[PDB]
């Protein structure tokens, strides 16, 4: 019935982080669309939808463990150029990865293995999809130049 | 091109209000699903998406007018019982309706008729769909009793 | 080529009665819809359309008998609560029943057998569908209580 | 919630005007049909249905603004000849057009923009479909002759 | 039956402006096609057809208001290079935007609300599609260079 | 590569003549449509589209010959009555027919046979479709009467 | 039956030129495919087939006129770089265009109008398709640079 308060409180820290991540992707994707980079809009819009699902999974788990979800998003750090927005989004995923890894350890100490399994799925997406794609973008800019990279994102 | 600063700031005021309304629906809908009221989950889940669409419309208009969107949501005031959560949502929508109506008058005053037309569509949804449904729910409770109303929301 | 003036005048009295019934069903169905009882709205909106077809048959018969139709509907008295609106409709239907039965006898005495037949079909609908349905609703309210009845009409 | 009494009251004036318009198109279409002018009947039968929809919109709007809809239709002024009936319907459309325009102005003054938007849609129909068609019918009679026009309406 | 002469005259000024815009899009799209930029041809050929539909709506409204349309298009000044043609189109669209906004205010002051509505839809297309697209192209040229931009328009 | 200046110049004279023809069919078709003559509107709307295509062919031909297309339409001379509008369009077709014939001769003299072939196709249309139809309409009015002709064009 | 000897010899002159043009496209298209420019291979492969069709048309006309076709192709002058190969093809097509135009004049002089019409179709393809496309390619290179142009031909 009732989850551990240490676990519940840490899930809430991740929830406010994921609500923030969803809103950062929201603004970035619409700035990308405003500038005419439709391929950057579509990928970031998809990531915004995925963060809503990640936050949803955490929200419902907190309610199941009888906790009170914290719905105030943490602050966001939007950039002003494509290289900057890509870097800010990679730094976000890096903080998310560290926080998710520490929550997985915490769930193991408190023997909340179902909450660990939920965090592990989100960590996989963070490393193998989000952060992986973002490092590809930055490495392509370095290899083909910003003019060519931006042209390909129209 | 560039909009009037007063119109852009007011659009940003409506944007932080709608980002908050979307988050109030997120929590309310998931509380409803956790309690097992699937019809209230589905309505309020649909309303959260519609608010995300409303916020996206404001967000893209602010960017088109060369403005900077404010992404920190307003404070939310969730409820703890179905009557409270419905009243809190009704109170939110009354505020949004007054705010959109004042924004429509302002847009007319500064001759930004496209911004006016975007707000008019949102004002229609607020009165004819959101506020209309919530007042129906509160009227149903008063007429059939909370026990019967909650049973019909399973 | 021309009908009896007594029969024309009575078809006209029936016509203004049926235009009134259509408009009472018009307002009652929309009040039911506004309160959120969609099954009551759907049933009363269908009875509105049936009254318009009933009025239409009398209107065309009056013109075929070389008469001039009276288009001013009778005054209506809608209720303000579900029990009052059901009683107001049952009262109207009972007057319509007696008016139709009186006109059938009038048509039989003036040997207008086609006008008698038009009125019998309307009488049969008035008795076997409308008043029967209304009498059922009032019986159900007494058996299951108004609260359960309204819940079932959502 | 609660609309402005001046608005609710003016919507009720338009409502009785529109219920009368529906009944004038009712009698005209059936007279046309009795005379054998099927094309005039279909068109005016279609306008009766459109006027019923316009009335529904106003009635549901009055109920949302917490008002009491008035169901007594205004007086109708039918014609006895095709030229007269056409002229009668145009006069009604012209009166309706002026009525809707004053209400649009009144709604703006009281800041009920949704009620205005409902009225603008009806005004567009009154001007771009109804009155346009009537004026066309009258110009056609002037150019090709009534005998020819009526033949074409068969 | 008749419109205000001031509104008729302003719709006429708008009409000659939109006939001109159609013919500028006509020549620009064909120059783009001749140079081998098929994506620029397809986009500008579609905007040509939209201007003809815009001109058509004004032309019919002028005739409905009992006015006489002015069919002499305004003079146009097409460019000779891709950057000049994009700037020439953006300049025209900015004048069209201001002319439409001025006519909307004119229609509101003379209570011609249907003519106001026709103009708003054209304003919305002028701002949210045309000028938005043109401003995007000029932004892309600055980010990726004219050489890459033209290659992408082949 | 480079066409003969006398040819390029004469194609530009035909171009402005054809852009004017497109605009005359534009206003005529919409006047016919405003009056309720749907068959005349469809036919003349179709001719406006065919004239736009004829203009496209000349414009693309001028661009291939490395010339600069002239986009200022010639003056148009619309009528106010059906008989006058028909006569006006025939006069225009007759002027166009003579113009196209002189150009065909000019192209042969300068040995640009492709430009001649484009012109012969347009001449065939001008004579075998456009002028033929107009003459038919006028002969019909003479035989069956204008009242009957107009009825048939409804 | 039998054609004029001067017309037959000129057709044979055009035939050896077109058999050469077909072979120049064969080598050029296969050089393009070997370098990996598949879009240039496919266009120039299609042009080789079209020239084979043009030669077949001349061949069959010469036989029908009781002539003897000359099957030795003219000398070809292939290029060694994409700019050279495009220029060499443009130079070839200019020669064919002048040769077909002179042949059309000759056919008219000897009143062989069918032979003229066969040459007119080939002259149209030469100017409007072959030469038009090649000048587009050279213009694209001048506008986007050879590196970008060659990339787009992969």
Tab-separated table of C-alpha atoms in Angstrom, chain F:
chain	number	residue	atom	x	y	z
F	1	UNK	CA	18.921	30.526	-76.294
F	2	UNK	CA	18.159	33.982	-77.514
F	3	UNK	CA	15.026	34.586	-79.504
F	4	UNK	CA	14.584	37.285	-82.092
F	5	UNK	CA	13.663	40.629	-80.465
F	6	UNK	CA	10.753	41.155	-82.872
F	7	UNK	CA	9.367	37.766	-81.821
F	8	UNK	CA	9.917	38.233	-78.069
F	9	UNK	CA	8.280	41.633	-78.328
F	10	UNK	CA	5.239	40.360	-80.174
F	11	UNK	CA	4.782	37.484	-77.731
F	12	UNK	CA	4.691	40.145	-75.018
F	13	UNK	CA	1.954	42.031	-76.839
F	14	UNK	CA	-0.096	38.834	-76.994
F	15	UNK	CA	0.692	38.133	-73.328
F	16	UNK	CA	-0.822	41.404	-72.104
F	17	UNK	CA	-3.740	40.785	-74.452
F	18	UNK	CA	-4.279	37.346	-72.935
F	19	UNK	CA	-3.928	38.535	-69.336
F	20	UNK	CA	-6.662	41.068	-70.100
F	21	UNK	CA	-8.818	38.339	-71.648
F	22	UNK	CA	-8.427	36.313	-68.449
F	23	UNK	CA	-9.564	39.295	-66.373
F	24	UNK	CA	-12.545	40.048	-68.628
F	25	UNK	CA	-13.722	36.449	-68.277
F	26	UNK	CA	-13.119	36.805	-64.529
F	27	UNK	CA	-15.522	39.729	-64.117
F	28	UNK	CA	-18.073	38.418	-66.632
F	29	UNK	CA	-18.291	34.963	-65.040
F	30	UNK	CA	-18.831	36.434	-61.574
F	31	UNK	CA	-21.482	38.868	-62.833
F	32	UNK	CA	-23.259	35.942	-64.499
F	33	UNK	CA	-22.967	34.030	-61.229
F	34	UNK	CA	-24.297	36.959	-59.224
F	35	UNK	CA	-27.308	37.172	-61.490
F	36	UNK	CA	-28.017	33.462	-61.171
F	37	UNK	CA	-26.845	32.187	-64.523
F	38	UNK	CA	-24.771	29.188	-63.443
F	39	UNK	CA	-24.287	27.826	-66.922
F	40	UNK	CA	-22.731	31.072	-68.134
F	41	UNK	CA	-20.554	31.244	-65.065
F	42	UNK	CA	-19.122	27.785	-65.464
F	43	UNK	CA	-18.359	28.314	-69.073
F	44	UNK	CA	-16.668	31.668	-68.579
F	45	UNK	CA	-14.869	30.517	-65.488
F	46	UNK	CA	-13.504	27.735	-67.609
F	47	UNK	CA	-12.367	30.205	-70.239
F	48	UNK	CA	-10.548	32.263	-67.604
F	49	UNK	CA	-8.582	29.191	-66.683
F	50	UNK	CA	-7.823	28.404	-70.299
F	51	UNK	CA	-6.607	31.982	-70.842
F	52	UNK	CA	-4.369	31.696	-67.809
F	53	UNK	CA	-2.837	28.595	-69.375
F	54	UNK	CA	-2.378	30.346	-72.683
F	55	UNK	CA	-0.595	33.123	-70.797
F	56	UNK	CA	1.630	30.627	-69.021
F	57	UNK	CA	2.749	29.203	-72.330
F	58	UNK	CA	3.704	32.591	-73.674
F	59	UNK	CA	5.426	33.642	-70.451
F	60	UNK	CA	7.537	30.491	-70.304
F	61	UNK	CA	8.331	30.860	-73.972
F	62	UNK	CA	9.478	34.456	-73.481
F	63	UNK	CA	11.681	33.359	-70.582
F	64	UNK	CA	13.254	30.623	-72.727
F	65	UNK	CA	13.987	33.084	-75.446
F	66	UNK	CA	15.707	35.077	-72.723
F	67	UNK	CA	13.177	37.843	-72.706
F	68	UNK	CA	11.395	39.787	-70.044
F	69	UNK	CA	7.710	39.144	-69.730
F	70	UNK	CA	5.326	42.082	-69.487
F	71	UNK	CA	2.672	41.591	-66.832
F	72	UNK	CA	0.496	44.694	-67.190
F	73	UNK	CA	-2.774	43.537	-68.635
F	74	UNK	CA	-4.376	45.375	-71.440
F	75	UNK	CA	-7.527	47.363	-70.757
F	76	UNK	CA	-10.750	45.416	-70.568
F	77	UNK	CA	-14.169	46.454	-71.773
F	78	UNK	CA	-16.868	44.649	-69.877
F	79	UNK	CA	-20.540	44.812	-70.588
F	80	UNK	CA	-23.504	45.498	-68.356
F	81	UNK	CA	-26.011	43.234	-70.038
F	82	UNK	CA	-25.814	39.669	-71.168
F	83	UNK	CA	-26.151	40.585	-74.801
F	84	UNK	CA	-23.464	43.268	-74.384
F	85	UNK	CA	-21.079	41.068	-72.448
F	86	UNK	CA	-21.353	38.364	-75.115
F	87	UNK	CA	-20.680	40.878	-77.837
F	88	UNK	CA	-17.754	42.228	-75.883
F	89	UNK	CA	-16.159	38.827	-75.554
F	90	UNK	CA	-16.589	38.113	-79.250
F	91	UNK	CA	-14.957	41.383	-80.157
F	92	UNK	CA	-12.079	40.477	-77.908
F	93	UNK	CA	-11.796	37.015	-79.474
F	94	UNK	CA	-11.834	38.576	-82.914
F	95	UNK	CA	-9.066	40.973	-81.928
F	96	UNK	CA	-7.114	38.141	-80.415
F	97	UNK	CA	-7.644	36.061	-83.543
F	98	UNK	CA	-6.185	38.690	-85.767
F	99	UNK	CA	-3.309	39.217	-83.352
F	100	UNK	CA	-2.410	35.554	-83.245
F	101	UNK	CA	-2.495	35.295	-87.015
F	102	UNK	CA	-0.059	38.172	-87.505
F	103	UNK	CA	2.287	36.598	-85.011
F	104	UNK	CA	2.136	33.263	-86.732
F	105	UNK	CA	3.195	35.034	-89.877
F	106	UNK	CA	5.909	36.932	-88.045
F	107	UNK	CA	7.320	33.778	-86.467
F	108	UNK	CA	7.536	32.089	-89.847
F	109	UNK	CA	9.347	35.062	-91.274
F	110	UNK	CA	11.937	34.958	-88.515
F	111	UNK	CA	12.115	31.125	-88.655
F	112	UNK	CA	10.935	30.434	-85.096
F	113	UNK	CA	8.609	27.621	-85.848
F	114	UNK	CA	8.134	26.467	-82.248
F	115	UNK	CA	6.799	29.869	-81.256
F	116	UNK	CA	4.502	29.627	-84.266
F	117	UNK	CA	3.234	26.224	-83.189
F	118	UNK	CA	2.346	27.566	-79.767
F	119	UNK	CA	0.399	30.354	-81.427
F	120	UNK	CA	-1.484	28.070	-83.864
F	121	UNK	CA	-2.807	25.995	-80.984
F	122	UNK	CA	-4.109	29.108	-79.280
F	123	UNK	CA	-5.619	30.313	-82.580
F	124	UNK	CA	-7.436	27.044	-83.018
F	125	UNK	CA	-8.908	27.419	-79.559
F	126	UNK	CA	-9.818	31.039	-80.180
F	127	UNK	CA	-11.653	30.125	-83.379
F	128	UNK	CA	-12.944	26.607	-82.835
F	129	UNK	CA	-13.972	26.909	-79.203
F	130	UNK	CA	-14.282	30.509	-77.909
F	131	UNK	CA	-15.594	32.439	-80.897
F	132	UNK	CA	-17.670	29.484	-82.062
F	133	UNK	CA	-19.418	29.350	-78.675
F	134	UNK	CA	-20.057	33.092	-78.592
F	135	UNK	CA	-21.553	33.151	-82.015
F	136	UNK	CA	-23.752	30.249	-81.033
F	137	UNK	CA	-24.997	32.099	-77.986
F	138	UNK	CA	-25.896	35.126	-80.083
F	139	UNK	CA	-27.674	33.099	-82.739
F	140	UNK	CA	-29.612	31.328	-80.083
F	141	UNK	CA	-30.843	34.611	-78.643
F	142	UNK	CA	-31.987	35.618	-82.100
F	143	UNK	CA	-33.906	32.423	-82.651
F	144	UNK	CA	-35.411	31.534	-79.269
F	145	UNK	CA	-35.449	34.902	-77.569
F	146	UNK	CA	-33.377	36.371	-74.780
F	147	UNK	CA	-35.876	35.397	-72.111
F	148	UNK	CA	-35.682	31.801	-73.179
F	149	UNK	CA	-31.909	31.888	-73.614
F	150	UNK	CA	-31.398	33.279	-70.143
F	151	UNK	CA	-33.720	30.690	-68.670
F	152	UNK	CA	-31.617	27.993	-70.282
F	153	UNK	CA	-28.481	29.498	-68.785
F	154	UNK	CA	-29.803	29.352	-65.285
